[PDB]
């Protein structure tokens, strides 16, 4: 790998610089290099890895949606034939997106998840595995689409099981996992009732635990609770 010659600490330092410069592709490459050093990641380092790839894949997803919409309209009745270019370019972006997802999933499988024993790390990585299978599911149309969806579900479910046993209901990782798994139900698994039930129960159980928190922890938890509420408002 091209980062093999750079010190782990230097990769982390440059990932932080790349974040400040809004250079998220660089940030992700630096964090991939850091993961490949083989040591476990601290909480802050896991956050850097997450932020970097979230921004990269988020831009790819937004572009894929623009192109998919154009392609959809080109196939409606009365549209002029414009050739293969829209499909080709949507496929190009899609293949790059799948490459990023495969890279993240590869880092999780080799070997972040298997070395993650504390709930804070293990739930975080399993949530990420669910997220990146979900992004693969957003673009999938083939023989393995059901298996891709089930891979996302299975990762989210293992993360959910650990988080309920090992984390308080206000833990931001537990909350963000529930938020995203709820979106999985709504947008991927055709299960809006499960999505709504999960969001509501998560919100209510967090509400009941806020009294235990410091002011700073309260701020962190209520931020994600508001996202759950936002989705509930969108869906009801």
């Amino acid at each position: 790998g091209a980062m093999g010659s750079m010190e782990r600490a230097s990769l982390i330092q440059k990932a932080k610089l790349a974040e400040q410069a809004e250079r998220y592709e660089d940030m992700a490459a630096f964090m991939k290099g850091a993961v490949e050093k083989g040591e476990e990641l601290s909480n802050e380092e896991r956050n850097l890895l997450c932020v970097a790839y979230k921004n990269v894949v988020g831009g790819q997803r937004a572009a894929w949606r623009v192109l998919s919409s154009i392609e959809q309209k080109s196939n409606e009745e009365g549209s002029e034939e414009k050739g293969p270019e829209v499909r080709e370019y949507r496929e190009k972006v899609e293949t790059e997106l799948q490459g990023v997802c495969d890279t993240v999933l590869g880092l999780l499988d080799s070997h972040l998840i298997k070395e993650a024993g504390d709930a804070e790390s293990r739930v975080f990585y399993l949530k990420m595995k669910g997220d990146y299978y979900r992004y693969l599911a957003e673009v999938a149309t083939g023989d393995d689409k059901k298996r891709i969806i089930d891979s996302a579900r299975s990762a989210y479910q293992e993360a959910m099981d650990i988080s309920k046993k090992e984390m308080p209901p206000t833990n931001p990782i537990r909350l963000g996992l529930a938020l995203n798994f709820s979106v999985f139900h709504y947008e991927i698994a055709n299960s809006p009732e499960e999505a709504i039930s999960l969001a509501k129960t998560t919100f209510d159980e967090a509400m009941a635990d806020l009294h235990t928190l410091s002011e700073d922890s309260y701020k962190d938890s209520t931020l994600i609770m508001q996202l759950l509420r936002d989705n509930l408002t969108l869906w009801t």
Partner: peptide, 5 residues
Amino acid sequence: FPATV
């Protein structure tokens, strides 16, 4: 789109 983190 709905919110995710």
